[PDB]
């Protein structure tokens, strides 16, 4: 009844943010269950914070141009959503960015409010020609998973404000592949290899620890039905 | 090949929901596809990190700037479909981006060019990646007979 | 649906149907011609009554009948006797104790038969889709249910014999005292050197122990020294026992012996002849060839567990995955029609007062109210028109919760077994007769 | 850990031909194979694996590893 | 942003089928959760099933028992779908004996203390007035399906014949998802899993064992990190 060989999660690091996780020989047919549940929970269930709206001075929602900046508004939207923010206010919070003169405006030069931290100051947001004139305020809100952009009537409240897509999940992707391994003359053992790509804010192994605890709680909710024993170790 | 053709196809293959939006990275777009708002067959603007060689026809065009820029080897946005991004990231990072439907003739073309310009090991790895992706997206293609 | 198939594929299917092996349990086709009954009865394998009487004793070995005149006749049913090709010819029994019989009625099936109807295979729930490349180039994927439930399993009886002939030097002897052997090899042998009945064997196992009379033995120097060191006497008698051919397995079921000195007659020289029946229950496995009626054949490439199968909305896994790429190129769309009609036969239908053209045709034909599971007959060139199939699919009996699983188009929602998420679009499902 | 583990391009440019590479790697494989089966004579002329080897190995794999490393040389008579 | 933990509620539709709902799940979570639950529910559930039998006067499953119209192989087929529950971790022997004419049935079988047959209405064979059936059955406990090839361990006992066994007592499992009434863009989905199982055990403890296996696996994964 007991599993012939107990699994054991192991780690293989190729970069400070990219990592690989292997499960040793596992019971036959259990690779896909664990692999796909882990992928989805890791991509979605973990919480985080990311921007939700942006406001640019002297610009309308239909007016896609911004004076004083060579770059356009859509690439600016892409760059801001790329930026990672760690927030804990649990309510919408605004962050300001005011800069003039020609040069480059980067995440380093952003001034964050109290209790909100920008993990990556290296990213360049805009390039200025002539007088910069750049004034911008962006809202940050903690969230879970991934939410597409929607209209909250903020454009009606203020014409400059526009929606933007958000990445609440600390992780960027998970690509799990399952292969067969031979144990004690038997080939009916599945090895699961999970490749987690995460942003610089969170270490991937902590993200999988959180995902595993979430899954453990969610499935141990099923223990309430009845106490039963299954062969293990 | 059916699966690869499905992976890179133009619109009208389904109701192109979530079309006309720009995604910060291929990974975010995959997130959107998983959420179901985006569909695999839909034109969108996708960024590419540095080192991603651009399409052969993208070399003359580039971004707008008053300073010299070299988009042959740095970031660049592109109006394509997520399926084409997946097809190219099966191909090696050195290969120029392919933005046209693959079918069967063009697949033979790119395979021949790979066999000409690349070492045998990379050719075999690319063939295996193409095989795996083709089977996966042929399963997901939902071709049937009724 | 022969009319919908190409001539080449129809030819291939006709040639393929003459190779389907009988299985442990035979099941008649859900959808087929109306003519299998005539083919089965006219074939000699079925055991039909010659008098119109009442059965008085029903059993596995024999069945007894008593005509009203007074004559008593008992039919002896063959049981697990090797055919020409090496397959069992087991014959089941249908009639009960006190039922009436008419002349020519079927009392016992044969190999590949059920209730007097031909049954060359079982009918499997099939879905058309490529599936991770296992069903590539017409290879077949099927559930572990077929292995688990013995849906596709057949007995195969092999017959090999040896003859204790008389040669110039002397007579060969069939005995348990085989020379130059261990003690455990000749463990299951009988008193005279014959494997017992019911003794599982493997490659190299001794079936019947035979020894050569003698031979001119010139011991080699090394053999001489080795024998002297070990003090073993090499004897002129030389082992020639029968052993199971390499790569074999099976439970022995019967042994027959014919002795020269007995009243039995034999060819000249052979003093004794022994034959042993080794029977194994071969289950469907990877590599074994499988095929349908319409010339669609393929080797099994993988047997996924029951859970890996893409299941339907109610949770019923599909027993086999077949490549859609085959039907358009093979120009045999008859199998798709068969699959749809098999689905319609599995779940009954009710048409009454619909006032539709196809509804009228069914009502005058009489095939209007059909209960679930009952077979359907579509003659070869008078089958069910496509309008009939469509209209019936609109009116399939609700299998559960008042909902029909197959959409009007003939396709259904298939949830991926492994990853879990639904497939993007409906998939054509139904029941196909596979051999 | 596979037949493709030493890629063919480096060996090919080292030997400048493909059949020549086959025969030369085969000669080296025969040499290492007959070395491993010396079982005690210790002939001075025989030379063992120059590269590191596993406890169980094929002579041809080690020969091709030596060719890839480049420390081996050939000379037609 | 909003935090809501999953909650499970149970409902009975039949004596051996039930529906279980989980409303607050995240978007795109219901299908994966239900599929993982179904996969573990089908493949692995402790259970008992006949792993071997013994018939007097029969040395192999190919021959026939006089007095019963069904040859021994059909008796193996009928036994293979017999459903049992065994509390003894070790093998347990049952005896089936029946004389005279009538319908041998699962009810007739002799259950030892602690081993119970749960489908008494099933009919195994039919006997004549002259017939006599006498069978010993071995009941083991396990999970999944084990073929007869690996269930053979006694060679000298030529009388014994092994039978492949099916242990899992769950028939089929299907899941569905919907949309919650809460007003948000995420649109949390309500997974509902319908499970129907054989008479061996209630569905509730079946999914309890499934959840036990899953929580053990994911707890291993978590604990071995950090």
UniProtKB/Swiss-Prot annotation, chain B:
Signal peptide: none
Domain of life according to the entry: Bacteria
Coiled-coil intervals, chain numbering: none
Function text: DNA-dependent RNA polymerase catalyzes the transcription of DNA into RNA using the four ribonucleoside triphosphates as substrates.
Subunit structure: The RNAP catalytic core consists of 2 alpha, 1 beta, 1 beta' and 1 omega subunit. When a sigma factor is associated with the core the holoenzyme is formed, which can initiate transcription.
Family of this protein: Belongs to the RNA polymerase beta' chain family.
Protein name (Swiss-Prot/TrEMBL): DNA-directed RNA polymerase subunit beta'
Residues of the whole record sequence present: 582 to 727 of 1299
UniProtKB/Swiss-Prot annotation, chain C:
Top-level taxon of origin: Bacteria
Residues passing through the membrane, by range: none
Signal peptide: none
Disulfide bonds: none
Known partners and oligomeric status: The RNAP catalytic core consists of 2 alpha, 1 beta, 1 beta' and 1 omega subunit. When a sigma factor is associated with the core the holoenzyme is formed, which can initiate transcription. The RNAP complex including the principal sigma factor HrdB also interacts with RNA-binding protein RbpA.
Role summary: DNA-dependent RNA polymerase catalyzes the transcription of DNA into RNA using the four ribonucleoside triphosphates as substrates.
Family: Belongs to the RNA polymerase beta chain family.
Protein name: DNA-directed RNA polymerase subunit beta
Organism: Streptomyces coelicolor (strain ATCC BAA-471 / A3(2) / M145)
Curated annotation (Swiss-Prot), chain D:
Organism superkingdom: Bacteria
Keywords, comma-separated and alphabetical: DNA-directed RNA polymerase, Nucleotidyltransferase, Transcription, Transferase
GO molecular-function term, one example from the UniProt record: bacterial-type RNA polymerase core enzyme binding
Documented EC number(s): 2.7.7.6
Reactions accelerated catalytically: RNA(n) + a ribonucleoside 5'-triphosphate = RNA(n+1) + diphosphate
One of the record's GO cellular component terms: cytosolic DNA-directed RNA polymerase complex
Gene Ontology terms: biological process: DNA-templated transcription initiation
Record keyword Transmembrane present: no
UniProt-listed SMART domains: RNA_pol_Rpb6 (SM01409)
Subunit structure: The RNAP catalytic core consists of 2 alpha, 1 beta, 1 beta' and 1 omega subunit. When a sigma factor is associated with the core the holoenzyme is formed, which can initiate transcription.
Function comment: Promotes RNA polymerase assembly. Latches the N- and C-terminal regions of the beta' subunit thereby facilitating its interaction with the beta and alpha subunits.
PANTHER family (UniProt xref): DNA-DIRECTED RNA POLYMERASE SUBUNIT OMEGA
Protein family per UniProt: Belongs to the RNA polymerase subunit omega family.
Protein name, UniProt field: DNA-directed RNA polymerase subunit omega
Organism: Streptomyces coelicolor (strain ATCC BAA-471 / A3(2) / M145)
């Amino acid at each position: 009844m007991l599993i012939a060989q107990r699994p054991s999660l192991t780690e293989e690091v190729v970069d400070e943010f990219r990592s690989r996780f292997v499960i040793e020989p596992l019971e036959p047919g259990f690779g896909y269950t664990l692999g796909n549940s882990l992928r989805r929970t890791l991509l979605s269930s973990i919480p985080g914070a990311a921007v939700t709206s942006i406001r640019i001075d002297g610009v309308l929602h239909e007016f896609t141009t911004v004076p004083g900046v060579k770059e356009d508004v859509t690439d600016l939207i892409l760059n801001i959503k790329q930026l990672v923010v760690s927030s804990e206010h649990d309510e919408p919070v605004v962050m300001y960015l005011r800069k003039q003169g020609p040069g480059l405006v980067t995440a380093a030069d952003i001034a964050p409010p109290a209790g909100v931290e920008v993990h990556n100051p290296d990213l360049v947001l805009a390039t200025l020609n002539g007088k910069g004139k750049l004034e911008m305020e962006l809202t940050v809100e903690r969230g879970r998973g991934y939410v597409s952009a929607v209209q909250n009537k903020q454009v009606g409240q203020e014409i400059g404000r526009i929606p933007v897509d958000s990445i609440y999940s600390p992780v960027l992707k998970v690509t799990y592949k399952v292969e067969a391994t031979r144990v004690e003359q038997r080939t009916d053992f599945d090895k699961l290899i999970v490749d987690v790509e995460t942003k610089q804010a969170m270490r991937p192994r902590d993200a999988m620890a959180s995902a595993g605890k979430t899954l453990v709680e969610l499935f141990g909710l099923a223990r309430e039905l009845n106490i039963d024993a299954e062969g293990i170790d | 090949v059916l699966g690869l053709f499905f992976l890179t196809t133009d619109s009208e293959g389904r109701s192109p929901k979530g079309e006309g939006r720009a995604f910060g990275s291929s990974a975010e777009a995959i997130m959107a596809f998983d959420a179901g708002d985006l569909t695999l067959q839909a034109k969108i603007d996708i960024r590419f990190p540095v080192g991603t060689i651009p399409p052969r026809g993208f070399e003359p065009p580039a971004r707008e700037e008053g300073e010299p820029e070299w988009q042959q080897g740095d970031t660049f946005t592109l109006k394509t479909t997520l399926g084409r991004a997946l097809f190219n990231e099966l191909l090696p990072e050195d290969y120029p981006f392919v933005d046209y439907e693959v079918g069967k003739k063009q697949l033979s073309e790119i395979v021949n060019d790979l066999a000409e310009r690349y070492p045998k090991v990379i050719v075999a790895a690319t063939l295996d990646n193409l095989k795996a992706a083709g089977f996966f997206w042929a399963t997901r293609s939902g071709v049937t007979v009724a | 649906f022969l009319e919908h198939d190409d001539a080449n594929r129809a030819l291939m299917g006709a040639n393929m149907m003459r190779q389907a092996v009988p299985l442990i349990k035979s099941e008649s086709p859900l959808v087929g011609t109306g003519m299998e009954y005539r083919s089965a009865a006219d074939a000699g394998d079925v055991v039909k009554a010659e008098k119109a009487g009442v059965v008085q004793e029903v059993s596995a070995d024999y069945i007894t009948t008593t005509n009203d005149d007074g004559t008593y006749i008992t039919y002896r049913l063959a049981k697990f006797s090797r055919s020409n090709q090496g397959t069992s010819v087991n014959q089941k029994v249908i009639v009960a104790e006190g039922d009436r019989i008419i002349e020519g009625q079927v009392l016992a099936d044969g190999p590949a038969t059920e209730n007097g109807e031909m049954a060359l295979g079982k009918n499997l729930l099939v879905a058309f889709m490529p599936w991770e490349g296992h069903n590539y180039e017409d290879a077949i994927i099927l559930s572990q249910r077929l292995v688990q439930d013995d849906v596709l399993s057949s007995i195969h009886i092999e017959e090999h014999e040896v003859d204790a002939r008389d040669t110039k030097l002397g007579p060969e002897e069939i005995t348990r005292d085989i020379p130059n052997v261990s003690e455990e090899v000749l463990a299951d042998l009988d008193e005279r050197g014959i494997i017992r009945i019911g003794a599982e064997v493997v490659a190299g196992d001794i079936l019947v122990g035979k020894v050569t009379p003698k031979g001119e033995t010139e011991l080699t120097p090394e053999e001489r020294l080795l024998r002297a060191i070990f003090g073993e006497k090499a004897r002129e008698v030389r082992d020639t026992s029968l052993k199971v051919p390499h790569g074999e397995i099976g439970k022995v079921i019967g042994v027959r012996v014919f002795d020269r000195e007995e009243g039995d007659e034999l060819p000249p020289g052979v003093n004794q002849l022994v034959r042993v029946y080794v029977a194994q229950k071969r289950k469907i496995t990877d590599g074994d060839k499988l095929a349908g009626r319409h010339g669609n054949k393929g080797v099994i490439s993988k047997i996924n567990p029951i859970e890996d199968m893409p299941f339907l909305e109610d949770g019923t896994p599909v027993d086999i995955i077949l490549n859609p790429l085959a039907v358009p190129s093979r120009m045999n769309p008859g199998q798709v029609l068969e699959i749809h009609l098999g689905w319609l036969a599995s779940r009954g239908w009710d048409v009454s007062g619909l006032a539709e053209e196809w509804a009228q045709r069914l009502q005058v034909i009489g095939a209007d109210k059909v209960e679930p599971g009952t077979n359907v007959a579509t003659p070869v060139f008078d089958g069910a028109r496509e309008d009939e199939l469509a209209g019936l699919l609109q009116h399939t009996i609700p299998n559960r919760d008042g909902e029909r699983m197959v959409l009007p188009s003939g396709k259904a929602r298939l949830f991926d077994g492994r990853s879990g998420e639904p497939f993007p679009e409906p998939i054509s499902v139904g029941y196909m007769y596979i051999l | 850990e596979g037949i493709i583990n030493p890629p063919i391009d480096e060996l090919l440019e080292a030997t400048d031909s493909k059949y020549s590479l086959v025969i030369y790697a085969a000669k080296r494989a025969r040499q290492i194979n007959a070395y491993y089966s010396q079982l005690g004579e210790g002939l001075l002329e025989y030379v063992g694996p120059l590269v590191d080897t596993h406890v169980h190995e094929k002579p041809l794999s080690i020969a091709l590893r030596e060719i890839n490393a480049g420390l081996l040389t050939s000379e037609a008579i």
